[PDB]
A paper describes a structure:
To gain insight into IniA-mediated drug resistance, we determined the structure of full-length IniA from Mycobacterium smegmatis (M. smegmatis), which shares 68% sequence identity with IniA from Mycobacterium tuberculosis (M. tuberculosis). IniA consists of an N-terminal GTPase domain and two HBs. Here, we determined structures of IniA, with and without bound GTP, and demonstrated that it mediates membrane fission in vitro. Our results suggested that IniA, like other BDLPs, has weak GTPase activity and nucleotide-dependent dimerization in solution, but tends to form nucleotide-independent homotypic interactions on the membrane and cuts the membrane.
IniA was expressed in E. coli, purified, and crystallized in the presence of GTP. A 2.2 Å resolution structure was determined by the single-wavelength anomalous diffraction (SAD) method. One IniA molecule is present in the asymmetric unit. Even though there is only a monomer present in the asymmetric unit of the GTP-bound IniA structure, through crystallographic symmetry a similar dimer is also observed in that complex. Four signature motifs wrap around GTP: G1 (P-loop), G2 (switch 1), G3 (switch 2), and G4. As expected, K49 and S50 in the G1, T70 in G2, and D141 in G3, with the help of a magnesium ion, coordinate the binding of the phosphate moieties in the nucleotide. K200 and D202 in G4 engage the ribose. K46 in G1, equivalent to the catalytic R77 of human atlastin 1 (ATL1, another dynamin-like GTPase that mediates fusion of the endoplasmic reticulum), points toward the bridging oxygen between the beta-phosphate and gamma-phosphate, suggesting a role in charge compensation during GTP hydrolysis. Furthermore, the G2 of IniA forms a U-shaped flap on top of GTP, likely stabilizing the positions of several key residues in the catalytic core. Analyzing the lipid-binding mode, we found a tartaric acid (TA) molecule (from the crystallization buffer) bound next to the predicted TM region.
Author numbering: -1 to 421, 457 to 594
Write the structure that this text describes.
């Protein structure tokens, strides 16, 4: 920058001179954030819709893997970097911060789900760099693994990437209209990530692609889902790039994708980042100002020292009490997380109980041996959709809790550094959700049911046989549902522990910072009473000089509104 970065540098210099290492680090993080913002755009959709090819054609770089049956098996984040680099994001137990493990940039195009460096631990995602001018602005794309197919996770598993995302591109090729799972996922996704667009891919392959697009637009409007649809051909885009052909690039309609990313993602988020760094600059300056103006008050107004110091002492004590387990904001957080953990599990099992009841009715209303595949498919879809709805519900409740904790902290004045009256930078935990082992892998009928070797010399009456087969199917359904509830509940629990950790770290950092700034102000006010009058004006002038420089930073920051 000219202005903003200078302002950060300028403020950091003042903080360094005042031995405020905490402020220096805070400003270091803020500056790093505005350079590498990581504005994440999740590329979602079912398998083989053209997600990876879209990403490759866009950046004109083969970071994604594209094959006719294989390719993406792990969530992959692509961000800007002049030099190629890559790392695994490997999970730690009990919602602890994930571990970054450097790998050679190649290993990507391999199955990294069992990368040797991970030591059998869960790989949440892969984060790779690419030197694409497109990413220069701070856009980061998340390619998603194949879902919706046999042996794969359900499309709703993609929802786990969205709480930490700023935008979503929903990929569906123009071979046919939206399926019901696609429609359900879109509705769920918009609850978490409102900024989204449909990319209707492979227009070069399907002559009637416009028919599908218009039918999809109609369907979206009937469902009350406000998402734009953008037609595109990655294939045309790729030739356009090769030929440096502006006209062919227009035909691929990729500029429309660029336009959406620019006007609804990059520009919008750049504004929010701009606001936060300006706020970071202002806060740092105001923390420094408190000690300066407190010492000034002690000088210019000696008869007010008792009230000034008593106030500063009071606020310091409150800031210190805020670091104790008994602090109200921490109580609200801890009790809130505990309640939500139980409530999320209660919600899930309620949804599952309703689903199990429906499936059992279906089983009792037919011949299960004539519908085992159809019954299994419906159950898996219903369960996976419920997991998705549960995840959305949990996200909304977690957001509400974080808001309440924020209010509790602020209303306690634990971030206030105004003069008394006188006269997350860590590794994120986002990844694919987990429900069942894979689609089409549950069968209500088990192997050793003995239908061939169960026949006696004499025939079983049908009534009993139906009853037995139906009871067997019900048993397997209830076990499947219970097993999923166990696995999902575990992920929910660890997720909330992670959120708890992130929020706790955040506010303890603020409390320590406030404690420090108040204690410096306190010492400054005390040390001023020790100087004889002969050195008053000399120190005072220096303070007024410091005061002006800091107020200049605040004002400069304010104008950058
Ligand atoms: N004609 C045409 N074919 C495309 C286009 N985009 C992708 N394909 C083909 O469609 C298939 C799917 O490509 P991918 O980009 O790997 O799709 P995907 O969603 O990433 O697949 P998964 O990662 O397994 O979920 C590939 O074999 C491509 O050759 C396109 O724009 N036009
Ligand atoms: Mg792919």
């Amino acid at each position: 920058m000219g202005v903003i970065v200078e302002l950060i540098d300028h403020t950091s210099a003042i903080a360094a001179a005042k031995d405020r290492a905490d402020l220096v680090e805070r400003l270091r993080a803020a500056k790093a954030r505005i350079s590498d913002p990581q504005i994440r755009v999740v590329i979602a959709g079912q398998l083989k819709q053209g997600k990876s090819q879209l990403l490759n054609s866009l950046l004109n770089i083969p970071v994604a893997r594209v094959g006719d049956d294989e390719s993406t098996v792990l969530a992959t984040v692509v961000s800007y970097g002049e030099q190629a680099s890559a790392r695994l994001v490997v999970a730690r137990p009990d919602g602890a911060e994930p571990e970054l493990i450097e790998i050679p940039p190649s290993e990507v195009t391999t199955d990294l789900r069992r990368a040797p460096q991970a030591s059998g631990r869960q790989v949440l995602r892969v984060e790779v760099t690419a030197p694409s001018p497109l990413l220069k602005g701070g856009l980061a794309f998340v390619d998603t693994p194949g879902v919706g197919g046999h042996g794969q996770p359900h499309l709703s598993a993609t929802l786990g990437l969205l709480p930490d995302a700023d935008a979503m591109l929903m990929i569906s090729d123009t071979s046919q209209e939206f399926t019901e799972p696609e429609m359900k996922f879109i509705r769920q996704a918009l609850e978490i990530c409102p900024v989204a667009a449909i990319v209707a891919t492979k227009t070069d392959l399907y002559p009637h692609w416009r028919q599908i697009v218009d039918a999809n637009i109609a369907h979206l409007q009937r469902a009350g889902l406000n998402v734009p649809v953008i037609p595109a051909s990655s294939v045309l885009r790729s030739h356009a790039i090769s030929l440096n052909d502006k006209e062919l690039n227009e035909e691929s309609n990729f500029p429309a994708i660029v336009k959406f990313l620019s006007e609804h993602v990059l520009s919008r988020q750049n504004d929010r980042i701009r606001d936060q760094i300006v706020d970071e600059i202002r806060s740092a300056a105001e923390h420094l100002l408190l000690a300066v103006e407190s010492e000034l008050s002690s000088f210019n107004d000696p008869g007010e020292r008792e009230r000034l110091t008593a106030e500063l002492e009071r606020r310091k004590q409150e800031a210190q009490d805020a670091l104790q387990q008994t602090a109200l904001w921490q109580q609200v957080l801890s009790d809130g997380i505990a309640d939500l953990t139980a409530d999320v599990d209660h919600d899930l099992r309620h949804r599952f109980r309703i689903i199990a009841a429906h499936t059992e009715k279906v089983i009792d209303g037919c011949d299960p041996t004539l519908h085992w595949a159809e019954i299994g498919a419906e159950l898996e879809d219903a369960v996976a959709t419920a997991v998705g709805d549960n995840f959305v519900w949990a996200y909304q409740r977690a957001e509400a809790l974080a808001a309440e904790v924020a209010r509790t902290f602020t209303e306690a004045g634990l971030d206030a550094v105004q003069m008394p009256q006188i006269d997350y930078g860590g590794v994120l935990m986002f990844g694919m959700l987990t429900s069942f082992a894979g689609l089409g892998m549950f069968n209500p009928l088990s192997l050793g049911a003995g239908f061939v070797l169960g026949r006696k010399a004499y025939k079983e009456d049908m009534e009993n046989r139906m009853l037995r087969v139906r009871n067997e199917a019900k048993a397997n359904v209830r076990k499947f549902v219970d097993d999923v509830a166990f696995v999902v509940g575990k992920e929910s629990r660890d997720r909330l522990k992670g959120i708890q950790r992130q929020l706790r770290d955040h506010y303890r950092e603020i409390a320590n910072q406030t404690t420090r700034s108040l204690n410096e102000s306190l010492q400054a006010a005390i040390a001023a009473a020790k100087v004889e009058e002969a050195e008053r004006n000399t120190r005072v002038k220096e303070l007024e000089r410091q005061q002006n420089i800091l107020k200049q930073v605040v004002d400069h920051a304010a104008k950058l509104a």
